[PDB]
Design a protein around this nucleic acid. Structure first.
Lengths: 365, 313, 141, 64, 68, 191
RNA sequence: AACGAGACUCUGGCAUGCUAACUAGUUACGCGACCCCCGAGCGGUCGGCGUCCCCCAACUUCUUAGAGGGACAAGUGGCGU
């Protein structure tokens, strides 16, 4: 994005301001609508060990990362419900804004009494940064493997490939009565991702009704007719020794905790971003996969090293993450936009400073 | 043009592949030996996800299995081992027919005749010896023998006459004719000890190699030194092609496949080039054998794998 | 045609020769059920391979075991170590590689001396102690 | 004191100290600041990469 | 641990490589059996040592020149 | 369940470690869940080798002490099966989560040691390993039940299950949470 | 250059390889006898329980004791001139 000279700032909502604001006693959501289908988990992966390792399959599925206005469910539910609209990834960025180090940007296209939080289709918004919150992140150019871009390419490439490798697409899916509205049912390939899309209810106070997309990635077979919903994400690595990290191959079993502590210093932004999504969903287990480069000079070949299921909420108790804070953040942003008129307003993070703003733009810019 | 693609690689060993052989009766089998003290009989699926699975594993040795060879029927299989004994297998469930008793040291080389009635052995005894299929000694060679270890012996295909090759570490190749058991000739050549020798399918040639790593050519019946070729650092195994006049030479980092008419290298097979240092960055190739189809060839390495290749036009 | 393969296990001089002979189910030890082998608190332990692998691996064999040596405890580990290997050997001989390779990965995961044996036995006492290391008291006055 | 419970992790072990080798010098990374590092004395057997539970980072080690 | 090689090994190891340089491979087992035939080492455990050092020397001799 | 052992009846799933500090020396369920706590007798020949073996087994080991009880590991397992049973009837939980809290609440945060100056006692405050915390916390609570049942009509099983409650919810009626706070009270003074 | 150290001797740990056994066993039947239908069936038979019967049976895994092999810092990654 380019910040123009004719865009009007009202308020600098810096991260010290927003880490104090809060909203208390958020009520239990009720689902507006659930759409899609989920595949079942392979229990064989519970017994993975380092010295009997298994590589990574690259599994391509046709993904949907559709924005708020172009999402037909968010579009039509505007006429029955809500007055703030978003998607799960646009929530997670706003929640975890306080740990950001590089720019993000969302066009809040206010309409009447309502807010469409439209992430752009020419942004790089949903790329997942690697070594971002480090002592000094990679400053390498975009011609290099170990750069901010190529590592985010690497990371985002792998994270959904392993979401489906967890899962048995040749076995029975649980199906919602409403199928996916982002593609037709004349997609008989079953080369859609395992995903279903909860559209859920919240109230932040001040007569606000948030109606936002959330999801799971996989369901795991339980027992006694019960099952365990899971958000799957994947922790990539490129080189240990160029970012003050830990070689997981040497230290996974003994220093299991130190490994996760690495990424509370080097990817702490991404960790709680993933956890925010899991708490937005209400997952039963938060699964992650350990993956690293097969050869540290080859950014294409990777190998699975292990998997570990944590319970997301007791996990949140451990990583010192609380969402009481989080709902005052989103509150404080809505304190700006509601008293303004309709228009494409831009909320972004400054690329060299730690402060977000609300711009008023001449519309269509 | 006839060139090589990397087909696939097999897995199922804890010890270095010592030899591989294949019967032309069943090219869908393939047989292997190794320093995990077992010979593994495979089941070849032609899927490129794998390239084969071990079917059964023949067990019972107290030291390495050096060389292995198939029967002409493919219903028997025979082994030579560094425990000083040989075994005669029944390649249908297991259950050794016979074990051959009598050597004081290792049995390095072994081979199985066309008529299935004569079986030879090279030993660090410094004795070539002949063996009935009943497991007793028709003859023993202890006069005009090698003065050092016996590296490899061969049965020669011929019009009908009995001729067998012998080569030792005394840098000589002796050819023997049965029913007098005399020296047919002595061939002198190669500086450093001899590893291997192999005979043409027509049978009038002996392609020999060793520590020298040079491929000298000899005439079986003319008794003439044809020529010499620089085959690299060391050549551990050799095997002619069944359907061509090529010769495939196994050197450490690469396999060198040579066209003979005219004399030139076709290609050099390179395997995975994975970063390792410094003494043998790839594993040495030690054995190799063609399939009877002549499309595919196999290789023995010291990383416990058998790499496959295929000819592509 | 008769099929019979035998194995043993050891721990601390407790031999347990467990033959796998063709048949169906019915594992025994000393001509008694394994369900009543007598400390009956370690009952889950000798049962562990059978329970974990399923009872459908034990549907082509009658296994009976004879034992000797050791105490009450070490015998339990011996009978477990033998039946684990017995099952394997039956597949190693009459069935293909990929059947038993699978079974090997499962057992050796929670290895607890099922497919291996301790080399540890008692050390020999020397004088000046009641034990091999422990010594009699030393007085200076 | 009135500081809340901190958590900090090992980066490297330095060597053993005390008058019977019972103390261990160690370098630790603050686990919230990746350029901050303090030296500590830690009693128990430690490896590397494990996390401690500091009650303060006012204290700092200099000798046995 | 410990197990630093004595002089009795290092004396004969050098000698055996000088006069039987050709016979050597770089494998343990082959270099063992050669030492067994070109000389007698009166123990078995001693033989397993002298081979291993003969092997370890032969690695370095294929680089620059040794000074021993 | 069919691929991972319970305890003979008690799930090792729905069991968490609620610290990030003390996990990777507390584990019980990664694959380390087994039907019984026992070993073949490998537990230590390296410093790292101690950590791996289960927490439930470690508890059984440190329960048999003081002469007459040594070398009676089977008698010891009787006391542990009753313990979990009593804990479940008495409060109603996954009775392993009780134990995990009881261990984590009993481990010290800071500790003192000795230092020689002027031929007179001076003390210095120092920190403590996670591996030290676990070893200490297992020691302390096992001393409680051993002490109580030395003249009480109550059996050691009853005493031990009571001792894990008062540790799991701090209340200073246990021998552990008392003795924990004594050490830290010293560590404040000389520091 | 020599003595001590080490080397050496004994012992433990690895062999379904080798050698051979009614003063050592196992397996297999031949079995006939006892036992209970305990399971399919009927009690027989098939299966299960030990003992007598065992051979001019088969074998040496278990037991026994001899000859041999195996481990060398050997291979890989760090570190050291």
């Amino acid at each position: 994005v380019e910040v123009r000279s004719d865009w009007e700032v009202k308020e600098e909502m810096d991260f010290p301001q927003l880490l104090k604001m809060r909203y208390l006693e958020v009520s239990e959501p009720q689902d507006i609508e659930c759409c899609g289908a989920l595949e079942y988990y392979d229990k064989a992966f519970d017994r993975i060990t380092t010295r009997s390792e298994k590589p990574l399959r690259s599994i391509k599925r046709i993904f949907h990362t559709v924005t708020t206005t172009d999402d037909p469910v968010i579009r039509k539910l505007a006429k029955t419900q809500g007055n703030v609209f978003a998607t799960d990834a646009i929530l997670a960025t706003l929640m975890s804004c306080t740990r950001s180090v590089y720019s993000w940007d969302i066009v809040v296209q206010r309409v009447g009494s309502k807010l469409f939080f439209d992430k752009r289709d020419n942004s790089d918004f949903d790329l997942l940064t690697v070594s971002e919150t480090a002592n000094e992140p990679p400053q390498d150019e975009g011609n290099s493997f170990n750069s901010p871009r190529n590592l985010a390419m690497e990371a985002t490439y792998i994270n959904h490939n392993f979401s489906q490798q967890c899962l048995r697409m040749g076995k029975e899916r649980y199906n919602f009565p409403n199928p996916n509205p982002f593609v037709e049912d004349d997609m008989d390939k079953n080369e859609i991702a395992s995903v279903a899309y909860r559209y859920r209810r919240w109230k932040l106070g001040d007569d606000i009704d948030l109606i936002v997309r959330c999801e799971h990635d996989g369901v795991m077979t339980g027992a006694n007719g019960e099952v365990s919903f899971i958000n799957i994400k994947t922790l990539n690595e490129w080189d240990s020794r160029h970012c003050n990290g830990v070689d997981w191959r040497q230290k996974l079993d003994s220093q299991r905790g130190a490994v996760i502590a690495t990424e509370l210093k080097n990817n702490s932004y991404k960790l709680a971003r993933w956890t925010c999504c899991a708490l937005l969903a209400g997952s039963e287990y938060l699964k992650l996969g350990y993956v690293s480069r097969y050869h540290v000079k080859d950014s294409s070949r990777h190998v699975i090293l292990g998997t570990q299921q944590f319970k997301p909420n007791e996990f949140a108790s451990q990583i010192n993450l609380s969402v009481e804070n989080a709902w005052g953040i989103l509150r404080c942003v809505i304190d700006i936009c509601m008293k303004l008129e309709e228009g494409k307003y831009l909320i972004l993070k400054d690329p060299n400073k730690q402060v977000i703003r609300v711009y008023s733009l001449p519309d269509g810019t | 043009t006839e060139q090589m693609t990397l087909r696939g690689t097999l897995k199922g060993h804890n010890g270095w592949v010592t030899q591989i052989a294949t019967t032309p009766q069943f090219p869908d089998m393939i047989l292997s030996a190794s320093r995990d003290k077992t010979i593994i009989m495979w089941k070849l699926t032609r899927d490129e996800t794998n390239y084969g699975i071990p079917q059964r594993a023949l067990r019972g040795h107290s030291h390495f299995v050096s060389d292995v060879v198939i029967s002409s029927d493919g219903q028997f299989a025979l082994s030579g081992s560094w425990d000083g004994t040989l075994r005669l297998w029944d390649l249908t469930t297991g259950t050794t027919t016979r074990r051959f008793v009598g050597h004081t040291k290792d049995v390095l080389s072994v081979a199985f005749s066309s008529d299935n009635r004569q079986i030879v052995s090279g030993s660090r005894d410094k004795t070539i010896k002949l063996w009935n299929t009943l497991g007793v000694c028709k003859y023993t060679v202890q006069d005009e023998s090698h003065s050092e270890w016996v590296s490899c012996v061969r049965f020669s295909p011929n019009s009908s006459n009995p001729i067998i090759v012998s080569c030792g570490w005394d840098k000589l190749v002796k050819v023997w004719n049965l029913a007098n058991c005399k020296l047919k000739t002595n061939h002198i050549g190669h500086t450093g000890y001899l590893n291997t020798v192999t005979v043409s399918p027509d049978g009038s040639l002996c392609a020999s190699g060793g520590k020298d790593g040079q491929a000298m050519l000899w005439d079986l019946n003319e008794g003439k030194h044809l020529y010499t070729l620089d085959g690299g650092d060391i050549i551990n195994a050799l095997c002619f092609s069944p359907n061509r006049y090529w010769l495939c030479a196994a050197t450490g980092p690469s396999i060198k496949i040579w066209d003979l008419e005219g004399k030139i290298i076709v290609d050099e097979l390179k395997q995975e080039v994975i970063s390792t240092s410094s003494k043998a960055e790839p594993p040495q190739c030690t054995s190799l054998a063609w399939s009877a189809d002549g499309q595919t060839l196999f290789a023995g390495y010291t990383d416990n794998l058998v790499r496959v290749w295929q000819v592509t036009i | 045609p008769l099929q019979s393969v035998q194995v043993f296990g050891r721990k601390k001089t407790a031999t347990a020769v467990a033959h796998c002979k063709r048949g169906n189910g019915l594992i025994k030890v000393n001509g008694r059920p394994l369900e009543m082998i007598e400390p009956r608190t370690l009952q889950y332990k000798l049962l562990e391979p059978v329970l974990l692998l399923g009872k459908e691996r034990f549907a082509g064999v009658d296994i009976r075991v004879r034992v000797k040596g050791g105490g009450h405890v070490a015998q339990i580990y011996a009978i477990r170590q033998s039946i684990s290997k017995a099952l394997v050997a039956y597949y190693q001989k009459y069935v293909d590689e990929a059947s038993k390779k699978e079974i090997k990965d499962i057992l050796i995961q929670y290895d607890r001396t099922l497919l291996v044996a301790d080399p540890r036995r008692c050390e020999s006492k020397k004088f000046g102690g009641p034990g091999a290391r422990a010594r009699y008291q030393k007085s200076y006055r | 004191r009135v500081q809340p419970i901190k958590l900090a992790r090992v980066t490297k072990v330095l060597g053993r100290t005390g008058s019977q080798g019972q103390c261990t010098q160690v370098r630790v990374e603050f686990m919230d600041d990746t350029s901050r590092s303090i030296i500590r004395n830690v009693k128990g057997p430690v490896r590397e990469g494990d996390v401690l539970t500091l009650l303060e980072s006012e204290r700092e080690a200099r000798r046995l | 641990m410990g197990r630093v090689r004595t002089k009795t090994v290092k004396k004969a190891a050098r000698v055996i490589i000088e006069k039987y340089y050709t016979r050597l491979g770089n494998d343990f087992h082959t270099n063992k059996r050669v030492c067994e035939e070109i000389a007698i080492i009166p123990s078995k455990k001693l033989r397993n040592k002298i081979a291993g050092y003969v092997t370890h020397l032969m690695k370095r001799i294929q680089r620059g020149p040794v000074r021993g | 369940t069919p691929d991972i052992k319970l305890f003979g009846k008690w799930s090792t799933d729905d069991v968490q470690i609620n610290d990030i500090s003390l996990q990777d020396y507390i584990a019980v369920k990664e694959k380390y869940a087994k039907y019984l706590p026992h070993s073949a007798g490998r537990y230590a020949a390296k410093r790292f080798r101690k950590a791996q073996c289960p927490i439930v087994e470690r508890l059984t080991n440190s329960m048999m002490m003081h002469g007459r009880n040594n070398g009676k590991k089977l008698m010891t397992v009787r006391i542990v099966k009753h313990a979990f049973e009593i804990i479940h009837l008495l409060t109603g939980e996954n009775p392993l989560q009780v134990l995990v809290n009881a261990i984590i609440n009993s481990g010290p945060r800071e500790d003192s040691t000795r230092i020689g100056r002027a031929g007179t006692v001076r003390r210095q405050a120092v920190d403590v390993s996670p591996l030290r915390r676990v070893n200490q916390a297992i020691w302390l609570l096992c001393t409680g039940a051993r002490e109580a049942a030395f003249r009480n009509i109550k059996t050691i099983a009853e005493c031990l299950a009571d001792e894990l409650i008062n540790a799991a919810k701090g209340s200073s009626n246990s021998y552990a949470i008392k003795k924990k706070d004594e050490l830290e009270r010293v560590a404040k003074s000389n520091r």
